[model samples]
Target: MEQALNRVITKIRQVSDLESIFSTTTQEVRRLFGIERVTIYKFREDYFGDFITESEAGGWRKLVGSGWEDPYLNEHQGGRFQQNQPFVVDDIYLGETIWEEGKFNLQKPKRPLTDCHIEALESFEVKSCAVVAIFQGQKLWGLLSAFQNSAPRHWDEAEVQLLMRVADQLGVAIQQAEY
Candidate 1:
C-alpha cells in the first residue's frame, strides 16, 4: 500500500510487478538524492542502457524515458563505475578531466568539458551528475545515476551512501521480482 519499502525502514517481501516497482524506487531515491534527477538505467543485451525509471525532484531538465547506447563504454561515467562504486563530481564545468571524465584521468585539462559534452548538457540545461554502478549478482547490470541540472555540487558521504544503499535495494528488488 506504500512505497519501495525503504528496505532500511519498512520492509516488504513482495515487489508484485517489476514495472511499477521502479516508480516507488524512483521516488525514494529522489528523496535521498536531493538533487535534480535520480534515475535507473537498465542495461540491455545490445550494450544500450534504457531509462526504465526516473524521478526529478526540482530541476530545469527532464531526461527520463529516454535511452543511451553504449553508455558504459561511451559515456565516461560508465568508465568511472568500472570499480563498482559511487562517484561524485562537484562541477561538470570546472575542468577538462573532472567528473565528466569520471575518476579515470581525472583527462588532460583544456576546457571545462569537451565540446560535445558541453553542447549535450547545455542543450538540456544540465550541469552535473553523480553516478554509481549497479550489479546484478556478480555481473554488471546497470547504473543508478543522480544528476544536478542547475549547477555544480560537492556530493557528500551521506548522499553517496544513500544512493549506494538504494542501488543495492534495486538489485535486491530485481532479484526478488525474478525470484
Candidate 2:
C-alpha cells in the first residue's frame, strides 16, 4: 500500500495545475482501491458542496458538476469532517462509524444515517462509502471519497488510512496550485 501511495504522490507531484491534480488524483485513488468511484467535492463558504470531479466505473450514473448541501453537514459546516475526521459506512441502510487519525476504537459510536441522508445516497447509488476531509491550510476545503454502489462494503482502518494520506497529499497539491 505504501508503494501504491507513492505512486499517487508521484503523479500529483508531476502535475502543477489544480484541475489536473483533482482529476488525476481521483482516478489514481479509484484505480488503487479498485472501488467503483472516487470523487472530489469542493465546499463553498456556506458549506454547500459541489461535485468537482470523479473517476467512476462504467455502470453508475455520473455525479460530477452536481451540487449538494447536506443539511446535516451545512449546519455544522462539515461537522466532524470539518474537524478533520474520517467517515466510513459499511452500509448506507445501516449506520456509520466516524473516526479521526487512527483511533477508531475510541471514536464516536456508530449511528444510522438520517432518512434524508439515505435518500441522498440512494439517489447517488451509494451503498457504502469512506471519506476524508481535504483541507487547504486550517480551512476545510473539500472531501475525497470512495463509494461502493454494488453492495455494502466493510471498510477497515487501513483503507481509511490510505484515503487520509491521499487527502493529505491533495491538500498539499491544492495549496501549491492555488498561488
- Residues 40-150, model 2: lDDT tens digits: 999988888899999999688899979888888889878888677888898998888766556576457778989989999888889999989998877789999999999
lDDT of each: 0.62, 0.87
Tens digit of per-residue lDDT, candidate 1, span 1-179: 01332553232224457666677667666665567777788876654677777778663455666766653345454564556755555676773323332233433442354666556556655577667777666566788877777778666645666666667767877877677
RMSD of each: 5.6, 1.8
TM-score of 2: 0.93
- Residue 141 lDDT in candidate 2: 92
* lDDT for position 27 in model 1: 67
